[PDB]
Design an enzyme around this catalytic site. Sequence first.
Site, mmCIF file in Angstrom:
data_model
loop_
_atom_site.group_PDB
_atom_site.id
_atom_site.type_symbol
_atom_site.label_atom_id
_atom_site.label_comp_id
_atom_site.label_asym_id
_atom_site.label_seq_id
_atom_site.Cartn_x
_atom_site.Cartn_y
_atom_site.Cartn_z
ATOM 1 N N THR A 1 0.657 -1.330 0.096
ATOM 2 C CA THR A 1 0.004 -0.019 0.026
ATOM 3 C C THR A 1 0.818 1.326 -0.042
ATOM 4 O OG1 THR A 1 -0.272 -0.141 2.436
ATOM 5 C CG2 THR A 1 -2.052 -0.859 1.097
ATOM 6 N N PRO A 2 0.233 2.375 -0.811
ATOM 7 C CA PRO A 2 1.114 3.563 -0.836
ATOM 8 C C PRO A 2 1.010 4.597 0.112
ATOM 9 C CG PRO A 2 -0.935 3.539 -1.924
ATOM 10 C CD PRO A 2 -1.058 2.291 -1.244
ATOM 11 N N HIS B 1 -2.722 7.396 0.781
ATOM 12 C CA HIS B 1 -4.041 7.266 1.492
ATOM 13 C C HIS B 1 -3.782 6.199 2.551
ATOM 14 C CE1 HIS B 1 -6.088 9.573 -1.193
ATOM 15 N NE2 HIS B 1 -5.983 8.891 -2.149
ATOM 16 N N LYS C 1 1.869 -4.889 3.646
ATOM 17 C CA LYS C 1 3.156 -3.994 3.955
ATOM 18 C C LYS C 1 2.705 -2.761 3.581
ATOM 19 C CE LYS C 1 6.976 -2.912 1.766
ATOM 20 N NZ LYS C 1 7.032 -1.617 2.364
ATOM 21 N N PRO C 2 2.737 -1.769 4.529
ATOM 22 C CA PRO C 2 2.395 -0.305 4.017
ATOM 23 C C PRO C 2 4.037 0.462 3.754
ATOM 24 C CG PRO C 2 2.690 -0.568 6.313
ATOM 25 C CD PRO C 2 2.516 -1.789 5.860
ATOM 26 N N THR C 3 3.938 1.458 3.224
ATOM 27 C CA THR C 3 5.123 2.267 3.026
ATOM 28 C C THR C 3 5.680 2.578 4.415
ATOM 29 O OG1 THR C 3 6.173 4.270 2.029
ATOM 30 C CG2 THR C 3 4.169 4.457 3.069
ATOM 31 N N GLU C 4 7.106 2.618 4.391
ATOM 32 C CA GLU C 4 7.639 3.078 5.901
ATOM 33 C C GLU C 4 7.625 4.574 6.060
ATOM 34 O OE1 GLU C 4 9.360 2.297 2.432
ATOM 35 O OE2 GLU C 4 10.464 4.050 2.402
ATOM 36 N N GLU D 1 -1.954 -0.972 -9.817
ATOM 37 C CA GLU D 1 -2.301 0.459 -9.873
ATOM 38 C C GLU D 1 -1.190 1.347 -9.683
ATOM 39 O OE1 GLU D 1 -5.060 0.452 -11.384
ATOM 40 O OE2 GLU D 1 -6.121 -1.574 -10.747
ATOM 41 N N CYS E 1 -3.634 9.740 -7.294
ATOM 42 C CA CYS E 1 -3.408 8.949 -8.541
ATOM 43 C C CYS E 1 -4.202 9.701 -9.444
ATOM 44 C CB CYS E 1 -3.755 7.427 -8.600
ATOM 45 S SG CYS E 1 -2.422 6.599 -7.458
ATOM 46 N N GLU F 1 4.332 12.900 -13.901
ATOM 47 C CA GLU F 1 3.353 13.023 -12.960
ATOM 48 C C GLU F 1 4.023 13.779 -11.726
ATOM 49 O OE1 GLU F 1 0.250 10.057 -10.203
ATOM 50 O OE2 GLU F 1 2.296 9.192 -10.453
ATOM 51 N N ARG G 1 -15.475 9.169 -8.126
ATOM 52 C CA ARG G 1 -16.044 7.814 -8.572
ATOM 53 C C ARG G 1 -16.595 7.390 -7.151
ATOM 54 N NH1 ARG G 1 -10.825 7.684 -8.191
ATOM 55 N NH2 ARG G 1 -9.526 6.774 -6.533
#
Lengths: 474, 474
Positions: free
Chosen positions: B145-146, B149, B171-174, B244, B281, B375, B437
Amino acid sequence: RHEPMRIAGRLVDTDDRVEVRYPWNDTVVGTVPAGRAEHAREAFAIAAAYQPKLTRYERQKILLATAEALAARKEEISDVITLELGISKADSLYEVGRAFDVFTLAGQMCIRDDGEIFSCDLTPHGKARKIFTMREPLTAISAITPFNHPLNMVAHKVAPAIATNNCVVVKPTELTPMTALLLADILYEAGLPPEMLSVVTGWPADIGMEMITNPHVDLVTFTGSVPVGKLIAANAHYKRQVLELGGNDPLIILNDLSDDDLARAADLAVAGATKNSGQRCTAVKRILCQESVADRFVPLVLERAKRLRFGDPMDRSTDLGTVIHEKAAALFEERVMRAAEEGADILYHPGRSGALLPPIVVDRVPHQSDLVLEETFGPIIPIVRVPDDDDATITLSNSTAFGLSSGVCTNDYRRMQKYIAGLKVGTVNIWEVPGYRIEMSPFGGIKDSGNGYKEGVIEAMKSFTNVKTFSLPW
Amino acid sequence: RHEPMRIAGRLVDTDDRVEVRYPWNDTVVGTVPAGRAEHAREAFAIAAAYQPKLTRYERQKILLATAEALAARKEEISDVITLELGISKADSLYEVGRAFDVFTLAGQMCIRDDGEIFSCDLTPHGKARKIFTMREPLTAISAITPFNHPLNMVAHKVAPAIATNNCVVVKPTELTPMTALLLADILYEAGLPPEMLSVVTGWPADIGMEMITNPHVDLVTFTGSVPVGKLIAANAHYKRQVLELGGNDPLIILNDLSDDDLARAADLAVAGATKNSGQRCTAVKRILCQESVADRFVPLVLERAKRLRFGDPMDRSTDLGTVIHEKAAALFEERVMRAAEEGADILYHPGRSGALLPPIVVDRVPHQSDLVLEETFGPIIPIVRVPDDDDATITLSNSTAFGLSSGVCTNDYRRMQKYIAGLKVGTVNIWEVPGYRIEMSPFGGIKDSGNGYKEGVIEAMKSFTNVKTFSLPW
């Protein structure tokens, strides 16, 4: 017969040739180009550049005309199939029948729009708005097809692509490439814009990797061996992959069956183990017979196996032709021999001749023997006696690396449902062979049998598109 | 605050620590374990061995209780989010609202069985038989996960897994791991069998690869950067992948709009470019304004941008908090500076302070400048002037490597439909920002934005299962 590649309708030749042999007598019956990466590369460039604009009606017309051409030319097409594969005319005519269904059902599916509509005023923070759903085609599809259904396996990949306004490039196996070339010609004649289909040929070492790796390719669809499938999975990096690999499918015979039912089950067992020379991903490869009915079941199987006529594939009275080549046939016989040394009982084996394997019947096969633990892609009829206990039977059935389809013969609903729930496979057929399905039901396996995506015309059409949503103020 | 990993409900600690910093003042607000491959490995073994047996009702209960706990604890949860990410409380509270929707809608989706029935007597060689369709869970899911969010992107991966009787390891980001740990606690309290969820933490170099590579993992679901995504695609060999990646999404302003409509479009532009500090994103990253209305549009944008309060993320009157860190903020400012050297016009830039970027307004941005071609994951509001010609505008819009979402403002139906058909993206919103959305509509991009699978609760539930068919004599 020398046949060039079909690259977007153009006949493209090459100096070096691949020889195609008739496994019945190992004679060369045809030749195709030893194509190279550059040829696939060109085909993919043409595919990428072309944007199909066929109406749903036009697609239906092409697809239905193709079906009609298949029906009209069935004797000619099945000749080509038998001459390169060695399956009986009975089997190859049947294959043309399947391909006819595939193109027909794909054509009928053209009228369906599975778009959805969502209302958006659903939560405290909804909007007066609607979201709509729609499908669009990909840039290019890569299709890699197996030797066992030189026509139908191409059909299953190409028909859904056409139905969905995709361009596809097909590379068939070098063992049976001629049928694919013929289908291409039929498609062009049926009105397919040539840019939508190329069929290229060559050695795996020359042209195989370009099929996995070409930058224009959005999706790779492959049917074939576990090794090659794992190889594709390792190299088709940022691409969708539809991988259908082998099966090792059981026909399970439960101990509630009457003697009449055992005879019907024996009919399924022999047909299932033996159709297409046993060369189906969903062929019966393990007959799991519960101990208490095995003594009555086995003789019924033996009797039916002996009725099968095996021999000259071009003889219309032949049931069972050859397998793909002598090396494959010798390997399968070897596994039978080894099983016998490990305790199995060979009951019928009139002897192998080259690529021609008889429908060998073996009883008391140890479940751990190579014969039934590995996928054995030939007309062996192997009975594994299993305990009169469903839990143990299910465990044994689930104990291989494969999980594609299955058949279970029983009249006891409770047991039916237990096997449906408990078998670790993509399909469970009650009172049919594992190979039974219709061309539009979801098809695909788990474990080493597939990466978990479904095929069949309907699911393939979904796989071959991107969903786009749009929303409007409402 | 020092937080251990959550491995199947067990608090698991490690000597070395990963420091979590508050980007507002670069102070340490928390610490989590520098986990290693072995920790992920254990989590996956537990996941593989456990077979969830929750009824649909039980799952609904857990999921709805989780939503309730999110609502009840929103201030506490948003505090944790803001302190590690630096987005304003307004944005982090909004995030809790989204996660509340995710869990609610997942809970309600539990009552749906999308099984199908096929009749088999369809062709000359059909059978009196029915095929039925059913879904089963996977062995283990890996979720990566990023940072943008820290709560909701974990929810989008975990809620569908629960709803579908899957075990998942996250595993989320550090950079933002503490929110995930808190969610795990909430889930256990809500009744989730602990084996169904682990949250592990550590440096990418220690524990990242095990998330991609563990042999029990059937599916990897990832949201994050293009580079990391391509890396996963290269190493997650024989595994389903839902990837994604970034977007570079346009808000397109057509020249049919009245001045009142330009004002409404300006509201969308500023909100879209700026929400979550521009860290979505689907954030507006390119405002494509047709030339003939640009002179009227731009002042409206400028005026709205100037009303944004940017500063202390914990102040409730702040609209715009910081970006993820000072390095990111400095990079984005750099791109603005370079765009200006290349002909762009900076209209509002009250100055950067550390990770705090104001909502910079830039007009006449060259479409090839890094600012809008790459981006740019910050609250920049960049107007690209485009020709009064839809074909040229569409071509320009489609000219980047990305294809995720989009918004188009116009009242002309013919032009609407032209953009809906012509934009190469997963979603086209008419009169809304590309980010718009609902939590259960299909979500996902093409090109470098994603490998072509859809997400959102409904599609994720399908992705997280295998379809099994069974057939019965009929």
